[PDB]
From Swiss-Prot, chain A:
Name listed for the protein in its UniProt record: V(D)J recombination-activating protein 1
Purpose of the protein: Catalytic component of the RAG complex, a multiprotein complex that mediates the DNA cleavage phase during V(D)J recombination. V(D)J recombination assembles a diverse repertoire of immunoglobulin and T-cell receptor genes in developing B and T-lymphocytes through rearrangement of different V (variable), in some cases D (diversity), and J (joining) gene segments. In the RAG complex, RAG1 mediates the DNA-binding to the conserved recombination signal sequences (RSS) and catalyzes the DNA cleavage activities by introducing a double-strand break between the RSS and the adjacent coding segment.
Portion of the full sequence shown: 391 to 480 of 1040
Tissue and organ distribution: Maturing lymphoid cells and central nervous system.
Record note on disruption phenotype: Mice display a severe combined immunodeficiency phenotype. The have a small lymphoid organs that do not contain mature B and T-lymphocytes. The arrest of B- and T-cell differentiation occurs at an early stage and correlates with the inability to perform V(D)J recombination. The frequency of homologous immunoglobulin pairing is much lower. No obvious neuroanatomical or behavioral abnormalities have been observed.
Amino acid sequence: RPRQHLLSLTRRAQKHRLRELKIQVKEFADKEEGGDVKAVCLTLFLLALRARNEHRQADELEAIMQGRGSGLQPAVCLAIRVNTFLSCSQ
Amino acid sequence: HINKGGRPRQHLLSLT
DNA sequence: GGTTTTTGTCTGGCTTCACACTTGATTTGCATCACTGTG
DNA sequence: CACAGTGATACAGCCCTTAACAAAAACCCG
DNA sequence: CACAGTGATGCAAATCAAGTGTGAAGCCAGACAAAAACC
DNA sequence: CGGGTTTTTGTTAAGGGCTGTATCACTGTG
């Protein structure tokens, strides 16, 4: 049977395509980086993203991994609402 | 074996 | 029928999130109020 | 020399690919 | 029976902070085992 | 004390693509 799209696969039915490769992922990380896998995959995915010119999603991933930037200060919210000539209902 | 020195291997998240 | 893909399971053991109660203590939501403005 | 808009357009700037080379910082040991 | 604002006020409702011991879920191991779409 | 080794960081140029900013004749309270 012909293959399907990688993203449409379930959480379990997509291991037979990464089984051959994640083993060299760990051995490379062990012999060069020290043993970290999440970090060495994160840097690889950042490489792919910024090569693909998707810096917006790259920065979003960086924010998710680091401290979340969600939430504005009340002072800056008021500054926006006032200096953009906005009304309370809008 | 003899140690040849070199720059220490910093954590991969702390490089450029 | 072959071939490849797609899901299913196995038990011991690990982490990770939700909850069981209760009493306040906030924080968010939405309706009220008499009015404008284009005629 | 009023000063903050008003929106469309065009140009500059910055960041990825190839691959080999070059300036520079951190230990090791004679 | 025009309809979208206009902002302050006030009360109903949602979320939570405190305490620890649970349940419930996701996943790791490597391996064995059934459905299903093209020849 | 300084080569030697390992690693970091930048550089060279032809292209592609996203983002940022200057420029144009005008407004409006008078």
